[model samples]
Target: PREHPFVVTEPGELARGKKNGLDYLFNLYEQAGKFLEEVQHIAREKGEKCPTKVTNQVFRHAKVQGAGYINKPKMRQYVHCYALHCLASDKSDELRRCCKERGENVGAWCQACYLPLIKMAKEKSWDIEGLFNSHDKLKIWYVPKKLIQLCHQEK
Candidate 1:
């Protein structure tokens, strides 16, 4: 019973080929929120001191397209970039702390690795299906230029 309120229990409903880009993007954001919520629970179960409120803050900082440095569309693109960067970069102090204190293996975690790439594929018109279909190859793949720039901008 690991279901989360923010998660879409049946994502196939959202990927039915009828919804537009904006709806798809909105779904992506909710999926990330659910993911973070689960991480909080996992941490507690493993005897770590992860706070739901702080994890929510991390999700908002990385996902929510609030007003600030860039334009809205670019801000949308930035969301994935920010999350992905946190896994690999040094500037992501807050996120890194959360991940470590939570005892999660982000380097190999499926959701941690792919959710960001999935959004990037959609935004770039890449084969989103390829991400799921060729899952193994993604582990060795490098981040591309367009998305990489957003990560740089955040630093």
Candidate 2:
């Protein structure tokens, strides 16, 4: 993701976290651990590895993708490296229900696209102005606070 326009300059900004960040992570980990035994069983039958745990504060507070609570990709990504990341975590028939809830294309042919708006920003040597006006609510543009703050430093 380096070609990304605003990758964080400092690692510490994303590492630091507030307490309730833990509460949110635990809630996801609870869902993560809940069906994990079977998840492990299935992953083994399919031949994959599942981590017993993820480090604290390593998920929500610093991320920019779909929510760990919803997409839960770290845990879901544990189920299958390719498809299951976007699928649902069902109890009735996990392996059978594995590919549901609708999704996108496979990894190989999945490449990239041209975002002209962002392209134009970079082309103009834009100063990244309009900070408060730029919180696009769209997860696609979100980055860590201090990192984005770094981009705003001189302006």
Candidate 3:
């Protein structure tokens, strides 16, 4: 429903084959696809235009070398976005099951879900840093280098 962060940077070489990045993405797509379908359904019921088909295209771009995956640091953002979308609108209970299948705790999983949305909110400059320092695991949320440079420039 909104512009994904993937397009924020240029794509690079996406790994392929078993146990590789592209393989992981294929599985991730299947998992998120189910949840995204439900999310779009809920959006449509509310009379909103959720053209989530574009998201499918975003996943496909992963295959076109130099178009999707970046280094580990950046590729995770793309993965995180999909996970966020799945868990955020998990009206059908499918996403939680996927979490269980992967042995993740529901509460911990849901807790981190908000940060992605919060990261995009307008007051991010005020909270991003505090949030960045608040926890160690928050490293998965983003890289602080960009945030530091971003605020420095604005100041």
Q: Return the candidate ranking by lDDT, descending.
A: 3, 1, 2
Give the Cα error of residue 88 in candidate 2, in Å.
28
TM-score of each: 0.25, 0.20, 0.23
lDDT of 1 by residue, 8-124 (tens): 112123323332222243344445544456666767899987653323344444445441222234324434434444333333333434544564543323235444554455543
Which scores better on TM-score, 1 or 2? 1
Evaluate all candidate structures by whole-model CA lDDT and list the values in order: 0.40, 0.30, 0.41
Q: Best candidate per TM-score, number?
A: 1
The alpha-carbon deviation from the true structure for residue 68 of candidate 3, after best TM-score superposition, in angstroms, is 24
Task: Show the colliding residue pairs in model 1.
Answer: none
RMSD of each: 18.7, 19.6, 16.7
Model 1 C-alpha lDDT versus the unseen true structure: 0.40
Q: Count the backbone clashes (under 3 Å) in each candidate.
A: 0, 0, 0
The number of the candidate with the highest lDDT is 3
Residue 101 deviation, candidate 2, in Å?
Answer: 22
lDDT of 2 by residue, 74-126 (tens): 43322221111122122212322222232222221111111112232353354
